[PDB]
């Protein structure tokens, strides 16, 4: 009866962005935290045994319920942008043919980065 882990759930909840890296690769970052999977696990736990998890935790899950697929798509955009920026870093003559396209795409990328806790223009960005 691992009820202490169920207490740890409450304690864990009781506990776009940008940050540095190591190879000077300022990757695109999401304002959220990797907790959507934990919220889904909480839902599984609730249907699993009927825990009396705090209503504040359930409401935080509902808060993330309206913005989590946007964050998953953001994470996919981040990882695929990494996947192809490494490919551009591979050679050098790529710039001579992709330059204007790079500038126009990166300007919209920065405009998408501009969202900080704003569900109004969060989706078009």
């Amino acid at each position: 009866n691992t009820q202490e882990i169920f207490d740890d759930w409450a304690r864990k909840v009781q506990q776009t962005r940008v940050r540095g890296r190591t190879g000077n690769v300022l990757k695109l970052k999401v304002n959220f935290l990797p907790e959507i999977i934990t919220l889904s696990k909480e839902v599984r736990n609730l249907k699993w045994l009927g825990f009396r998890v705090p209503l504040a935790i359930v409401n935080k899950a509902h808060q993330a319920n309206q913005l989590y697929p946007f964050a998953i798509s953001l994470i996919e955009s981040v990882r695929t942008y990494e996947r192809t920026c490494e490919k551009v870093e591979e050679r050098n003559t790529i710039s001579l043919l992709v330059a204007g396209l790079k500038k126009e795409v990166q300007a919209l990328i920065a405009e998408g980065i501009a969202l900080v806790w704003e569900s109004y223009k969060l989706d078009p960005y």
């Binding site: 962005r17 940008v18 690769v25 695109l28 920026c85 551009v88 500038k103 920065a110 980065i113 501009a114």
Partner: peptide, 15 residues
């Protein structure tokens, strides 16, 4: 023209 340093400029103090 730049490969990735343009994002290094639009992420240092962008938020």
């Amino acid at each position: 023209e730049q490969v990735f340093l343009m994002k290094q400029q639009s992420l240092l103090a962008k938020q």
